[PDB]
Write a protein that binds this ligand. Structure first.
Ligand SMILES: [Zn+2]
Ligand SMILES: [Zn+2]
Lengths: 549, 98, 370, 463, 109
């Protein structure tokens, strides 16, 4: 019973495959794959050998499939939009540009509904949605002539945008919502015309919807953006997946729940309430999962398989409404990005090492003794790491306590105690004798009055400014400065430093001398580039201290 | 420093750690108290000692004479302890009893 | 310390004031080697009558239920320091109660040592182990061939402290635990205590075999009492002393006042003839000067037909009439006892002359019509 | 091992290939593939498929050497390769490359027919690209091209080889030099020429803009990281003479490095704490792949051929976690243990998250400290020079700071982490005004400090 | 506002019944013995005293004294005052078959 099988392998750049771009889709028994390269592959899933590969030019960015017409639409990056019959009369086959249809060459994303081919094309700064026919009878696979356009005025620019169809019940690759929700989000217009709706999440973050029936325009009738495109919610961060879920499960499933998903892991869920006033209300939830999210999908019954960079995790909304917090167990598979979920639950993924794999989720004698042995070895293995992490925690804890002391000292010094007595520093002038000449020395005493211990990370900086006036000619020393490490200090203790102030040249001292102490606290030492300084004090020597009689 | 007059909180010097060239050499290439004593006759030391002062007979004046050149002898003259503790010029501690 | 300048540092080290005016604290708060996230906000002034206090979902599930106390403390507490002292205490309590969900043993010592020790005992012994591995239960045999079980409950630190030993037998079991001791040690003490009480067991085994014991039905091994039936609709209950089983028991009589009296008289006359060298039965038979029935009725024992609240027949003319609607209970009651009981319970609701509630014994819907 | 009778092994997509030149009787030795997979019931390797390939001549001196998975450039499919050497004892050596397909069929790509036997770091790389040397001359033969090439540059060893992004194929042979293998010949933030003397094996990990983060390991049996030329987190290894490193992933957040040694032993170090979680002795082979089917890698260790005359027996498979396999009632205790494993694992995952939370709070409170005391750049930029035995540091100001109105000073502050002891440290400050082409017109005020060096080069270093 | 749940609410039902029984005044004690025999009679012939004697010490919070003062009372002091005096009476009556560690914790209270 191997829960994960490996099917085939692909060329992976160092540092892993790219997020966003690579995609996996599955037909009845085929699986179609793109890896963010010039290639698109087809795997017969019985024995996972590749039937056929398709070399396009330039980086397939998104795929879709039509089962009834048996076609495969793809988006080349800077070129347009290709089409391939799956019969398609080395196993590699390069595509001739005969297959190109609407080469718009600026189109960033596209999706499909029944008879329509909604696309979305980067112009200049403002991106613009378009909408095409697509001929229902099996003919030359054509777009047809453009029914409509719009301008997504809100968007002014790596991350491709995303599109989702949200048709209602009664009226297709997308998701069919239920009527109460449909009515909550898109209103009476959409309800009554029984119009599909298109949700575009853009790399900007905000996620805008546009009603299709409302989107018919012409050169005599241009589509008005401020009327026609509207904006559900402003996620701060780029958008990765939009879906819908059957919570309360108690193919055409009348979904009930709306899911959006940020890159950085703001999930957002919406559901219909009709609560508390006899009125329909919306249920917003901005959950916050961890991680950069890489891909997402939807599985039977409110489960949402997503893939952080660490592992393939999973979240359940299925059961007040949905969920107070989202709490989300891994399933012990690697960073799979590009996840797809067929229901029977048996999901298909591409491992960021670049592998294709089909994850299929769900006594005796003395051999029992071997089992015991294995489990005991296991627990011994893991315990030693749990050990390691506790010690780590102890260090970061130590840090916080230290930092705390710092913040308490800091706050005490800037406060006005009405008596400056967390830390004090007197200076005092004297006279000594060196070789022949009397020298003038400043003692700088540091005294701790308050309880707070200055442990490692603090350092005294004293600065001796010989005079305060700047001349035509810059002197050879406007000021000297000294700095000493203060270590542990402790409470009530005292440290002393003596400084020369006194004539090393000419026997000439001009007085006022200003001796200024300050303290610097360094974040790094306990573990923009920063610190803080704090103003202890400033003593002036005014000649009267330099007399000796 | 401990027996000193002021009894003021001075940091202990703890002279420099082995050599800043030693440090260089470690990085670039990576116990009982010792005692000595003498005895001497009280008769010799008496005719040899004081004549001078009060002089509690031997133990205190002997140490005063031993430290007559040290700057902190007058304190021991006052306090009369016949025994003392202090720090070195190089940083080690030294306790001298008589 | 007294003032909230060093005392707050010392008593909640991992609460860091963000703002210069110390108004917003953020960080962690400690309890039983576990740090919980916590973020606090005061007003412009130092009044807690209004303040914000947010927590991680870790901390709220654990302060589940006490929400109203904490909410109250926010309004009642004078200083922040005392509010934190109280909330750490409170948190300790909420953790110590639901100690089931919150723990982690030290595997390197624990799981291996316990399995080594169960191997030292012998795997013939062990009969049960809990998924949390906290409770285990072992078995032993008498020389007579009787099984006696022992439950231990183990802490996070097994070898360090004593494990709580629970055993059936009626004298208090005493187990000299050392830090050096292990399961073999306490098990040897248990076998010693078993062999001590052998005689009491022999007594009760002989009684339950050769006599219709009545109301310790399927009696435990703790049980000292044996309501023996004799003749018809009269019984003698008999309590035995474990240290001195063969010695004279406490015995007296329930049943018909006219039948029992001559029996009490005959007992009085023969009590000097008691002898603790024979058996209890072999002494009682010649003391009360009668024989017993060996299970005169096995099917229709005295099914207790008493109130199951007041334990009396004939409460004030009334009979046990109101019964349980249950095959497994079938317990009669009285109107009065069962009315005063149901009017008490919180679950019960009263229609006009009817009260619906739970049967005291089995907690099933029972109806009482006054 | 490399002989006719003797095998070589390989791991391809959660299974194990056994290539053997079986000298077969009518016939010359045949290349045989067994393809073997791990049952999980029976705790053995069972044969799931076979394949054979006849080499065309009754000529001796066939030899397996060099075999891994590569990625063919036509498709984008990894496949097993195998390099035969063919010697007719003519002083001519053929050197086939075979690539074996999903169908259990082989596909030659290169014949390549050299004259002298090769004896050096033979190393296959992505676009099936053989690459070897004799006397400090590197040669490579792509399968795309078909033609032999010499490397224009001149290198001693070829420490790393593989597709760095946007540079096609590449070599690191001298740690400055970083070739292309299209246009033969940035060396700025690769590991130092200081370490270049001891580095024996490298293995790049990730790339940004360039800037690569990279592990290495050395002759002193060390193991070191680098993030843009920043030797973080050195480790040390018990055993000697290291050959190679692989990487292993194993699960949620755990990374190991499996390090192999010449002495037929190997170790695993747990990233996040460059330590040793396990060491082994013995070992015909080591392989790293997901063997189990659990969706995390494991490591498979083969123990010496002393045991039996049969291969893939005497194995051991070990995540170094929950998964561990190898070659009187008791049942009631087990599910307590199984639950004990799962509580332990969950407790692990919660500690890690908890730890992250602690770091986030420490950062938050640094920034809070900084903002509590307190935009326009008051200072351009910093520079320092050493004159003889003095250090001078100076800083060039901007318009906003007017030395007419503000006396300014500067100070230097040593990291106390180095300075276990405390001297003072002194600095003299000059202001320097120079007028710029007075012959509006820019003055230049800069502000400078001077100090002794030799007091600060106690620890070979300082910050 | 003034609804109070019974403080024995959360215990194994048998203990709940015992403590419910003892509530009923001075003939409260006698009743207890009938309860213990009427649980010897049912499927769980032994009665797990060790758990009741743990649960009797477990603490919860109360607010007594001035208006605001948080205090921690074990169960034994929190359940109704005639239940206390008839509990301890029924433990006096059945002391021999009790584990001493628990008993002592109770006396400690
Ligand atoms: Zn009654
Ligand atoms: Zn009932």
């Amino acid at each position: 019973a191997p829960r994960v099988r490996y099917l085939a392998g692909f060329c992976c750049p160092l540092g892993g495959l790219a997020a966003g771009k690579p995609r996996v889709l599955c037909h009845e028994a085929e699986v179609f794959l793109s890896t963010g390269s010039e290639l698109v592959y087809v795997y017969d899933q019985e024995g996972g050998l590749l039937t056929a590969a398709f070399r396009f030019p330039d980086q397939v960015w998104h795929l879709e499939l039509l089962a009834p017409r048996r076609l495969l639409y793809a988006l080349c990056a800077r070129r347009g939009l290709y089409c391939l019959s799956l019969d398609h009369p080395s196993p590699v086959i390069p595509v001739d540009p005969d297959a190109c249809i609407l080469p718009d060459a600026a189109l960033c994303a596209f999706t499909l509904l029944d008879s329509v081919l909604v696309t979305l094309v980067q112009g200049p700064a403002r991106w613009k949605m378009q909408l095409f026919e697509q001929p229902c009878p099996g003919e030359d696979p054509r777009p047809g002539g453009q029914i409509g356009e719009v301008e997504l005025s809100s968007y002014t620019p790596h991350f491709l945008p995303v599109l989702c169809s949200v048709s209602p019940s009664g009226s297709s690759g997308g998701f069919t919502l239920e009527d109460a929700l449909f009515g909550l989000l898109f209103g009476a217009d959409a309800t009554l015309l029984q119009s599909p709706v298109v949700l575009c999440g853009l790399p900007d973050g905000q996620l805008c919807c546009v009603i299709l029936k409302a989107l018919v325009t012409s050169r005599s009738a241009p589509g008005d953006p401020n009327a026609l495109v509207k904006i559900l919610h402003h996620l701060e961060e780029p958008v990765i997946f939009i879906g819908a879920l059957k919570t309360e499960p108690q193919e055409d499933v009348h979904c009930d729940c709306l899911v959006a998903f940020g890159h950085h892991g703001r999930m957002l869920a919406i559901k219909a309430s009709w609560d508390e006033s006899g009125k329909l209300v919306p249920e917003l939830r901005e959950y916050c999962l961890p991680g950069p999210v890489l891909c997402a999908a939807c599985g039977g019954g409110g489960r949402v398989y997503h893939s952080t960079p660490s592992d393939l995790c999973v979240v359940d909304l299925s059961r007040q409404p949905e969920e107070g917090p989202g709490g989300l167990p891994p399933m012990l598979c690697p960073a799979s990005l590009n996840i797809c979920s067929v229901v029977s639950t048996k999901l298909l993924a591409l491992s960021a090492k670049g592998r294709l794999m089909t994850c299929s989720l769900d006594m005796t004698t003395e051999s029992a003794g071997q089992k015991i042995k294995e489990l005991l070895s296991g627990i011994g293995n893991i315990s030693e790491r749990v050990s390691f992490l506790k010690k780590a925690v102890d260090q970061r804890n130590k840090a916080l306590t230290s930092l705390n002391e710092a913040m308490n000292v800091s706050c005490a010094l800037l406060s006005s105690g009405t008596g400056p007595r967390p830390i004090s520093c007197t200076t005092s002038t004297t006279w000594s004798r060196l070789q022949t000449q009397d020298v003038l020395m400043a003692t700088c005493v540091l005294e701790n009055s308050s309880s707070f211990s200055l442990d490692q990370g603090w350092t005294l900086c004293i600065q001796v400014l010989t005079s305060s006036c700047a001349l035509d000619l810059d002197s050879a020393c406007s000021a000297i400065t000294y700095t000493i490490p203060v270590d542990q200090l402790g409470p009530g203790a005292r440290r002393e430093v003596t400084l020369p102030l006194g004539p090393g040249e000419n026997g000439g001292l001009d007085l006022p001398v200003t001796v200024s102490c300050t303290l610097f606290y360094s974040l790094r030492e306990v573990v923009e580039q920063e610190g803080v300084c704090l103003p202890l004090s400033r003593h002036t020597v005014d000649m009267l201290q330099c007399l000796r009689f | 420093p401990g027996l000193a007059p002021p009894h003021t909180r001075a940091p202990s010097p703890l002279g420099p750690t082995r050599d800043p060239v030693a440090t260089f050499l470690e990085t670039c290439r990576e116990l009982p108290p010792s005692v000595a004593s003498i005895k001497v006759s009280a008769e010799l030391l008496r005719a040899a000692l004081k004549d001078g002062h009060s002089g509690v007979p031997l133990c205190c004046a002997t140490l005063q004479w031993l430290l007559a050149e040290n700057a902190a002898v007058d304190v021991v003259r006052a306090r009369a302890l016949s025994s003392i503790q202090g720090v070195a010029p190089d940083g080690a501690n030294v306790h001298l009893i008589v | 310390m007294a003032v909230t300048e060093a005392s707050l540092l010392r008593q909640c080290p991992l609460l860091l004031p963000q703002n210069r005016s110390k108004t917003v604290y953020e960080g962690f708060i400690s309890a039983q080697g576990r740090d919980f996230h916590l973020r606090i906000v005061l007003p412009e002034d130092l009044q807690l009558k209004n303040a914000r206090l947010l927590c991680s979902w870790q901390l709220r599930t654990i302060l589940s239920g006490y929400h109203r106390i904490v909410q109250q403390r926010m309004q009642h507490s004078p200083d922040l320091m005392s509010f934190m002292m109280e909330l750490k205490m409170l948190l300790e309590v909420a953790l110590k109660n639901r100690q089931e969900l919150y723990a982690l043993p030290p595997p390197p010592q624990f799981y291996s040592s316990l399995i080594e020790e169960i191997g030292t005992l012998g795997w013939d012994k062990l009969v049960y182990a809990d998924t949390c591995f906290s409770t285990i239960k072992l078995k032993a045999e008498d020389a007579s061939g009787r099984e006696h079980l022992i439950t231990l409950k183990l802490k996070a630190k097994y070898p360090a402290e004593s494990p709580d030993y629970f055993v059936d037998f009626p004298v208090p079991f005493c187990a000299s635990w050392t830090p050096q001791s292990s399961l073999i040690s306490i098990y040897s003490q248990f076998l010693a205590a078993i062999e001590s009480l052998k005689a009491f067991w022999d007594v009760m085994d002989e009684i339950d075999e050769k006599t219709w014991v009545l109301e310790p039905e399927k009696p435990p091994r703790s049980a000292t009492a044996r309501r023996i039936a004799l003749g018809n609709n009269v019984s003698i209950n008999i309590e035995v002393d474990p240290r001195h089983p063969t010695m004279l028991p406490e015995c007296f009589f329930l049943g018909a006042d006219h039948v029992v009296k001559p029996l009490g008289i005959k007992l009085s006359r023969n009590i000097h003839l008691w002898d603790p060298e024979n058996s209890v039965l072999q002494n009682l038979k010649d003391v009360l000067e009668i024989d017993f029935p060996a299970r005169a009725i096995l099917e229709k024992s005295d099914f207790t037909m008493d109130c199951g609240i007041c334990y009396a027949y004939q409460l004030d003319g009334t009979i046990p009439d109101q019964v349980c609607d249950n095959s497994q209970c079938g317990q009669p009651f009285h109107q009065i006892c069962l009315y005063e009981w149901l009017r008490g319970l919180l679950t019960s609701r009263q229609s006009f002359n009817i009260i619906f509630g739970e049967c005291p014994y089995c907690s099933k819907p029972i109806t009482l019509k006054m | 091992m490399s002989s006719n009778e003797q095998e070589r092994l390989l791991c391809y997509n959660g299974e194990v290939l056994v290539f053997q030149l079986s000298k077969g009787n009518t016939k010359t030795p045949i290349l045989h593939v067994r393809r073997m997979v791990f049952d999980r019931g029976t705790k053995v390797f069972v044969q799931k498929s076979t394949g054979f390939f006849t080499i065309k001549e009754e000529n001796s001196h066939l030899k397996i050497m060099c075999c891994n998975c590569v990625s063919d450039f036509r498709t984008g499919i990894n496949l097993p390769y195998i390099v035969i050497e063919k010697n007719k004892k003519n002083n001519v050596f053929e050197y086939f490359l075979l690539i074996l397909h999903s169908t259990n069929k082989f596909e030659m790509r290169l014949s390549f027919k050299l004259g002298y036997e090769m004896k050096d770091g033979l190393r296959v790389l992505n676009g099936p690209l053989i690459l070897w040397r004799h006397v400090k001359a590197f040669f490579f033969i792509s399968s795309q091209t078909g033609k032999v090439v010499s490397v224009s540059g001149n290198f001693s060893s070829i420490q790393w080889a593989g597709e760095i992004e946007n540079l096609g194929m590449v070599l690191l042979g001298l740690k400055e030099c970083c070739l292309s293998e299209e246009e033969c010949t940035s060396d700025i933030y690769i590991i130092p020429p200081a370490y270049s003397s001891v580095v024996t094996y490298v293995h790049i990990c990730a790339t940004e803009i360039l800037r690569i983060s990279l592990i290495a390991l050395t002759r002193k049996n060390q193991l070191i990281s680098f993030q843009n030329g920043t030797p973080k987190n050195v480790c040390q290894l018990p055993f000697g003479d290291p050959c190679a490193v692989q990487l292993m992933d194993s699960g949620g957040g755990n990374l190991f490095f499996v390090v192999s040694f010449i002495s037929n032993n190997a170790c695993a170090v747990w990233k996040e704490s460059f330590q040793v979680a396990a060491k082994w002795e013995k070992l015909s082979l080591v392989l790293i792949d997901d063997f189990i089917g659990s969706g995390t890698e494991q490591v498979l260790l083969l123990f010496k051929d002393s045991l039996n005359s049969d291969c893939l027996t005497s194995f051991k498979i070990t995540d170094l976690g929950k998964i561990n396999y190898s070659s009187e009632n008791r049942y009631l205790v087990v599910p307590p243990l199984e639950t004990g494993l799962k509580v332990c694992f969950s407790s692990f995952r919660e500690l890690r998250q908890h730890l992250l939370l602690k770091e986030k709070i420490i950062s938050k409170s640094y920034k809070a400290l900084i903002n509590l005391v307190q935009s326009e750049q008051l200072v351009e930029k910093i520079w320092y020079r050493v004159i003889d035995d003095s250090l001078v540091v100076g800083v060039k100001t901007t318009s906003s700071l007017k030395l007419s109105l503000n006396d300014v000073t500067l100070s230097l502050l040593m990291d106390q982490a180095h300075d276990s002891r405390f001297r003072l440290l002194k600095c003299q400050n000059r202001v320097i005004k120079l007028s710029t082409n007075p012959f509006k017109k820019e003055c230049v005020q800069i502000i400078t400090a001077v100090t002794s060096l030799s007091p600060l080069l106690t620890f070979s270093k300082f910050c | 506002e003034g609804v109070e749940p019974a403080p024995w609410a959360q215990l194994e039902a048998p203990a709940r019944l015992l403590l419910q029984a003892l509530q009923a005044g001075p003939e409260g004690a006698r009743r207890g013995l009938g309860v213990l025999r009427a649980l010897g009679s049912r499927g769980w012939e032994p009665f797990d005293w060790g758990r009741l004697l743990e649960a009797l010490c477990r603490e919860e919070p109360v607010v007594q004294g001035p208006d605001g003062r948080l205090e921690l009372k074990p169960l034994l002091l929190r359940l109704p005052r005639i239940c206390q005096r008839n509990l301890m009476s029924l433990l006096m009556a059945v002391r021999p078959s009790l584990p001493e560690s628990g008993l002592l914790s109770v006396l400690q209270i």
